[PDB]
Write a protein that binds this ligand. Structure first.
Ligand SMILES: CC1(C)Nc2nc(N)[nH]c(=O)c2N=C1C(=O)NCC(=O)NCCS(=O)(=O)C[C@H]1O[C@@H](n2cnc3c(N)ncnc32)[C@H](O)[C@@H]1O
Length: 158
């Protein structure tokens, strides 16, 4: 299965954190990274007076079940980040969000796939569009169409 995962951090110097996370993603059992997007420097969604976030998207090949994948991404978040990643409008030490999981639709207590707000977040959509410009969601929506419809500002690279 190809899972698409969003990475964000707004540590002041986030490259080492983001690399640690990427390495951890690759080390997940029965999984490996297919592709990584460029790293983007994005203005905070929330209070403007925190550092900018580094956002990226990753394609991960996996034979884990979706909730097993989430178990790992949450583990990585605990091991690599702190309860900065939990302040509601930031800062965020490290978030890992499962955007898509194959062509599955998931709505459980633990998981909402496709991700619950990605269609409102250019910082999730643009890096995804870099690595998967032809992406079609399970319901038939097209990533390209969402970006065209909403006109979200293009992102600057880190
Ligand atoms: C502060 C805010 C909004 N602003 C940002 N501005 C910029 N430029 N860039 C950012 O990356 C950025 N991130 C933000 C932010 O808060 N991001 C994380 C976030 O939304 N957290 C609240 C939602 S959450 O389900 O708890 C996220 C958390 O739920 C878990 N999770 C992962 N995938 C999931 C899924 N598909 N369904 C359900 N849970 C999943 C995981 O622990 C994740 O951190």
């Amino acid at each position: 299965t190809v899972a698409y995962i969003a990475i964000g951090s707004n540590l002041a110097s986030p490259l080492e954190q983001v690399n640690a996370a990427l390495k951890a993603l690759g080390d997940i059992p029965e999984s490996h990274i297919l592709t990584v997007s460029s790293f983007y420097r994005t203005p905070p969604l929330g209070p403007q007076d925190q550092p900018d976030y580094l956002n990226a998207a990753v394609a991960l090949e996996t034979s884990l079940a979706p909730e097993e994948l989430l178990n790992h991404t949450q583990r990585i978040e605990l091991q690599q980040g702190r309860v900065r990643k939990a302040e509601r409008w930031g800062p965020r030490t490290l978030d890992l969000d499962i955007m898509l999981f194959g062509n599955e639709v998931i709505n459980t207590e633990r998981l909402t796939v496709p991700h619950y707000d990605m269609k409102n977040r250019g910082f999730m959509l643009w890096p995804l569009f870099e690595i998967a410009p032809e992406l079609v969601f399970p319901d038939g929506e097209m990533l390209r169409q969402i970006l065209h419809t909403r006109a979200f500002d293009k992102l600057n690279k880190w």
